[PDB]
Short mmCIF file of C-alpha atoms and ligand atoms in Angstrom, two decimals:
data_model
loop_
_atom_site.label_atom_id
_atom_site.label_comp_id
_atom_site.label_asym_id
_atom_site.label_seq_id
_atom_site.Cartn_x
_atom_site.Cartn_y
_atom_site.Cartn_z
CA UNK A 1 -6.75 -26.01 10.32
CA UNK A 2 -7.93 -23.18 8.08
CA UNK A 3 -6.07 -22.93 4.74
CA UNK A 4 -4.32 -26.26 5.18
CA UNK A 5 -3.44 -29.05 2.79
CA UNK A 6 -3.92 -32.77 3.41
CA UNK A 7 -0.89 -34.21 5.24
CA UNK A 8 0.78 -37.33 3.85
CA UNK A 9 -0.15 -40.35 5.99
CA UNK A 10 3.36 -40.73 7.42
CA UNK A 11 4.50 -37.09 7.72
CA UNK A 12 3.50 -36.46 11.36
CA UNK A 13 3.48 -39.81 13.21
CA UNK A 14 3.44 -38.23 16.67
CA UNK A 15 0.08 -36.54 16.02
CA UNK A 16 -2.79 -38.11 17.95
CA UNK A 17 -6.57 -37.60 18.07
CA UNK A 18 -8.06 -37.05 21.54
CA UNK A 19 -11.67 -38.17 21.46
CA UNK A 20 -14.54 -38.33 23.91
CA UNK A 21 -17.36 -40.81 24.23
CA UNK A 22 -20.55 -39.45 22.70
CA UNK A 23 -23.49 -41.88 22.90
CA UNK A 24 -22.58 -45.17 21.22
CA UNK A 25 -19.58 -43.57 19.53
CA UNK A 26 -16.58 -41.25 19.80
CA UNK A 27 -16.02 -37.63 18.79
CA UNK A 28 -12.72 -35.94 18.05
CA UNK A 29 -12.18 -32.96 20.35
CA UNK A 30 -8.43 -32.16 20.39
CA UNK A 31 -5.03 -33.06 19.08
CA UNK A 32 -2.02 -34.12 21.04
CA UNK A 33 1.55 -35.29 20.65
CA UNK A 34 2.69 -38.81 21.57
CA UNK A 35 5.83 -38.22 23.68
CA UNK A 36 6.30 -41.68 25.26
CA UNK A 37 4.77 -45.01 24.31
CA UNK A 38 2.35 -44.41 27.18
CA UNK A 39 2.22 -40.60 27.42
CA UNK A 40 0.51 -37.88 25.37
CA UNK A 41 1.12 -34.14 25.63
CA UNK A 42 -1.98 -32.04 25.02
CA UNK A 43 -3.61 -28.73 26.13
CA UNK A 44 -5.00 -28.41 29.64
CA UNK A 45 -8.19 -26.85 28.29
CA UNK A 46 -8.85 -30.01 26.28
CA UNK A 47 -9.40 -31.93 29.48
CA UNK A 48 -11.39 -29.34 31.58
CA UNK A 49 -14.61 -31.29 30.89
CA UNK A 50 -15.41 -34.42 32.96
CA UNK A 51 -15.60 -36.63 29.85
CA UNK A 52 -14.47 -40.17 28.98
CA UNK A 53 -11.42 -39.76 26.76
CA UNK A 54 -9.50 -42.07 24.44
CA UNK A 55 -6.42 -41.49 22.33
CA UNK A 56 -6.10 -42.66 18.73
CA UNK A 57 -2.60 -43.00 17.28
CA UNK A 58 -1.83 -43.83 13.65
CA UNK A 59 -4.94 -41.94 12.61
CA UNK A 60 -5.37 -40.16 9.27
CA UNK A 61 -9.02 -40.07 8.31
CA UNK A 62 -11.48 -39.68 11.18
CA UNK A 63 -14.31 -40.98 9.03
CA UNK A 64 -12.68 -44.03 7.40
CA UNK A 65 -10.69 -47.13 8.42
CA UNK A 66 -7.03 -46.46 7.60
CA UNK A 67 -5.74 -49.87 8.69
CA UNK A 68 -3.20 -48.19 10.95
CA UNK A 69 -5.10 -46.89 14.00
CA UNK A 70 -4.49 -47.99 17.61
CA UNK A 71 -7.11 -47.03 20.22
CA UNK A 72 -6.19 -46.66 23.89
CA UNK A 73 -7.97 -45.36 26.96
CA UNK A 74 -6.65 -42.51 29.10
CA UNK A 75 -5.62 -43.79 32.54
CA UNK A 76 -4.41 -40.64 34.24
CA UNK A 77 -4.66 -36.93 33.47
CA UNK A 78 -2.04 -34.56 34.87
CA UNK A 79 -2.84 -30.89 34.22
CA UNK A 80 -0.25 -28.23 34.93
CA UNK A 81 -1.04 -27.12 38.50
CA UNK A 82 -1.02 -23.43 37.58
CA UNK A 83 -3.64 -23.91 34.84
CA UNK A 84 -6.75 -21.74 35.29
CA UNK A 85 -9.66 -22.47 32.96
CA UNK A 86 -10.88 -18.84 33.59
CA UNK A 87 -7.65 -17.39 32.14
CA UNK A 88 -6.12 -19.10 29.05
CA UNK A 89 -4.08 -15.92 28.54
CA UNK A 90 -2.18 -16.65 31.78
CA UNK A 91 -0.64 -19.72 30.12
CA UNK A 92 0.10 -23.12 31.64
CA UNK A 93 -2.15 -24.65 28.97
CA UNK A 94 -0.56 -28.08 29.03
CA UNK A 95 -1.48 -31.51 30.30
CA UNK A 96 -0.04 -35.01 30.14
CA UNK A 97 -2.16 -38.09 29.65
CA UNK A 98 -0.94 -41.51 30.79
CA UNK A 99 -2.31 -44.12 28.40
CA UNK A 100 -3.84 -47.34 29.78
CA UNK A 101 -1.53 -49.34 27.48
CA UNK A 102 1.72 -48.63 25.66
CA UNK A 103 1.21 -48.15 21.95
CA UNK A 104 3.32 -49.89 19.32
CA UNK A 105 5.64 -47.70 17.24
CA UNK A 106 5.89 -47.87 13.44
CA UNK A 107 5.86 -45.56 10.40
CA UNK A 108 2.51 -44.10 11.54
CA UNK A 109 3.19 -43.97 15.27
CA UNK A 110 6.35 -42.29 16.57
CA UNK A 111 7.40 -40.23 19.57
CA UNK A 112 7.44 -36.49 19.02
CA UNK A 113 10.84 -34.85 19.19
CA UNK A 114 10.80 -32.05 21.80
CA UNK A 115 13.10 -29.02 21.76
CA UNK A 116 15.82 -28.49 24.33
CA UNK A 117 14.72 -26.43 27.37
CA UNK A 118 14.75 -22.67 26.87
CA UNK A 119 14.90 -22.80 23.05
CA UNK A 120 13.29 -19.77 21.36
CA UNK A 121 12.81 -19.58 17.60
CA UNK A 122 13.90 -16.62 15.50
CA UNK A 123 11.04 -14.55 14.10
CA UNK A 124 9.56 -16.05 10.91
CA UNK A 125 10.90 -19.57 11.64
CA UNK A 126 9.38 -22.30 9.47
CA UNK A 127 6.69 -24.41 11.19
CA UNK A 128 3.59 -26.45 10.35
CA UNK A 129 0.47 -26.76 12.43
CA UNK A 130 -1.32 -30.08 12.07
CA UNK A 131 -4.77 -31.26 13.09
CA UNK A 132 -8.34 -32.23 12.27
CA UNK A 133 -9.75 -28.93 13.55
CA UNK A 134 -12.28 -26.70 11.72
CA UNK A 135 -11.36 -25.87 8.13
CA UNK A 136 -13.17 -22.54 8.34
CA UNK A 137 -14.13 -20.17 11.28
CA UNK A 138 -17.40 -21.68 12.54
CA UNK A 139 -16.96 -24.55 10.08
CA UNK A 140 -16.51 -28.27 10.56
CA UNK A 141 -13.69 -30.62 11.44
CA UNK A 142 -11.51 -32.04 8.69
CA UNK A 143 -11.87 -35.68 7.77
CA UNK A 144 -8.23 -36.11 6.82
CA UNK A 145 -5.31 -34.75 8.86
CA UNK A 146 -4.40 -31.23 7.68
CA UNK A 147 -1.19 -29.20 7.78
CA UNK A 148 -0.61 -25.46 7.30
CA UNK A 149 2.61 -23.56 7.00
CA UNK A 150 2.63 -21.04 9.87
CA UNK A 151 5.92 -19.15 10.34
CA UNK A 152 6.55 -17.93 13.89
CA UNK A 153 5.92 -14.38 15.05
CA UNK A 154 8.35 -13.59 17.85
CA UNK A 155 7.31 -12.39 21.31
CA UNK A 156 8.20 -8.74 20.69
CA UNK A 157 5.91 -8.55 17.62
CA UNK A 158 3.25 -10.94 18.90
CA UNK A 159 2.78 -9.02 22.15
CA UNK A 160 2.71 -5.63 20.38
CA UNK A 161 -0.59 -3.70 20.46
CA UNK A 162 -1.82 -4.51 16.93
CA UNK A 163 -1.18 -8.25 17.46
CA UNK A 164 -2.08 -9.86 20.80
CA UNK A 165 -0.77 -7.24 23.23
CA UNK A 166 -0.47 -8.39 26.87
CA UNK A 167 -2.57 -11.49 26.16
CA UNK A 168 0.53 -13.30 24.85
CA UNK A 169 3.21 -14.37 27.34
CA UNK A 170 6.82 -15.43 26.82
CA UNK A 171 5.71 -18.96 27.75
CA UNK A 172 3.86 -19.07 24.41
CA UNK A 173 4.78 -19.31 20.75
CA UNK A 174 2.81 -17.34 18.14
CA UNK A 175 2.68 -18.54 14.54
CA UNK A 176 0.89 -17.44 11.38
CA UNK A 177 -1.47 -14.43 11.45
CA UNK A 178 -1.64 -14.01 7.65
CA UNK A 179 -5.46 -13.97 7.64
CA UNK A 180 -5.61 -17.12 5.46
CA UNK A 181 -4.05 -20.00 7.41
CA UNK A 182 -4.47 -20.84 11.08
CA UNK A 183 -5.42 -23.33 13.72
CA UNK A 184 -9.12 -23.54 14.51
CA UNK A 185 -11.35 -25.37 16.93
CA UNK A 186 -10.40 -29.00 17.30
CA UNK A 187 -6.69 -28.33 16.63
CA UNK A 188 -6.24 -27.45 20.33
CA UNK A 189 -3.70 -29.65 22.10
CA UNK A 190 -1.93 -30.67 18.90
CA UNK A 191 1.62 -29.93 17.78
CA UNK A 192 3.33 -27.02 16.09
CA UNK A 193 6.24 -28.72 14.30
CA UNK A 194 9.18 -26.40 13.57
CA UNK A 195 12.26 -27.20 11.48
CA UNK A 196 15.47 -26.54 13.39
CA UNK A 197 18.94 -27.89 12.38
CA UNK A 198 17.33 -30.20 9.86
CA UNK A 199 14.89 -31.85 12.27
CA UNK A 200 11.24 -31.05 12.94
CA UNK A 201 10.56 -30.69 16.67
CA UNK A 202 7.30 -30.00 18.44
CA UNK A 203 7.72 -26.42 19.69
CA UNK A 204 4.06 -25.70 20.42
CA UNK A 205 0.91 -27.15 21.96
CA UNK A 206 -2.04 -25.44 20.23
CA UNK A 207 -3.80 -23.18 22.79
CA UNK A 208 -5.93 -20.40 21.35
CA UNK A 209 -7.07 -18.21 18.49
CA UNK A 210 -9.01 -14.88 18.47
CA UNK A 211 -12.59 -14.89 19.66
CA UNK A 212 -13.22 -12.96 16.41
CA UNK A 213 -12.22 -15.94 14.27
CA UNK A 214 -9.57 -18.48 13.44
CA UNK A 215 -7.79 -16.89 10.47
CA UNK A 216 -7.65 -13.26 11.57
CA UNK A 217 -4.86 -11.03 10.27
CA UNK A 218 -2.39 -10.14 13.07
CA UNK A 219 -3.99 -12.66 15.39
CA UNK A 220 -1.60 -15.57 14.90
CA UNK A 221 -2.45 -18.90 16.41
CA UNK A 222 -1.05 -19.14 19.93
CA UNK A 223 0.69 -22.21 21.36
CA UNK A 224 2.06 -23.21 24.75
CA UNK A 225 5.84 -23.06 24.34
CA UNK A 226 6.98 -26.60 24.83
CA UNK A 227 10.57 -25.60 25.63
CA UNK A 228 9.33 -23.71 28.71
CA UNK A 229 7.95 -26.98 30.19
CA UNK A 230 10.68 -29.61 29.68
CA UNK A 231 11.42 -29.93 33.41
CA UNK A 232 7.71 -30.06 34.26
CA UNK A 233 7.17 -32.77 31.62
CA UNK A 234 10.15 -34.82 32.85
CA UNK A 235 8.99 -34.43 36.45
CA UNK A 236 5.53 -35.77 35.68
CA UNK A 237 6.78 -38.74 33.69
CA UNK A 238 9.31 -39.61 36.44
CA UNK A 239 6.70 -39.45 39.25
CA UNK A 240 3.97 -41.42 37.44
CA1 LIG B 1 -9.30 -43.61 10.45
#
C-alpha cells in the first residue's frame, strides 16, 4: 500500500497473508480474505505459479512474532474457470483456497463480511485497502499491515478514456487514483473494505494497478468485484 498508515492490530481480522516457501523460509506474496474457517478468497493471479503456499491468519508484522499468528497449509486451490493469466483485464481474477485445517476465530481472526450479490457502490464511496504490499512503486513490502483510504470511482468514470478505458469491466471495482495512495505489488488478492449501512464489507479482491506505477493519478487500483461472484463462491464452497 502506497500512502498508507499502519492498521491497528484488530481492525481487519479477515486479512490474511498468502506466502510461498522460499528456501528454508517463507515469503509473503499476496493478501486474501478469510471467508470460512477453512476457506480464503484471493486473486487468481496470486496462484498462477506452481509454488508451495501457506496462509497466515492473525498476522500483523511480517518480520516479528505478534503472538497471534496461526499458520496453515493450502489443501486445494480453486481458480475461477474463466481466468486467463494472459488477460487480467478480462476479469475473473478470483480464487478460493481450502485450508488444510480450520483456523480458530478470535479478535485477530474473523470471517470477512461479503456484500449481497449485485451490490454496486455509489461513486466516491468510503473504502480502505489493506495489505503488506510495496509502500512505494518499485519499493519494498511493508513490515506492518497498512491501510489506505481509497474512495471508489464508479464504472462510468473508471472506464472513461482518461482513466482505464475498456480495460476496466463492470465485474471490477475501481478505488483511489489520487496519485498519492494506492495498492501496490504484494497487496494483490487482499480485501477492499467498504463501509455500507454502518458495516465494513469486503467489496473488492485486489487485482491490478497501472504498469506505469502504483500511485498514478487517474489510474485507480482495480479490484475484482466480490458482489459479482457470490453464487460462484457459494457453489465452490458447497461442492468442496
Ligand atoms: Ca508476525
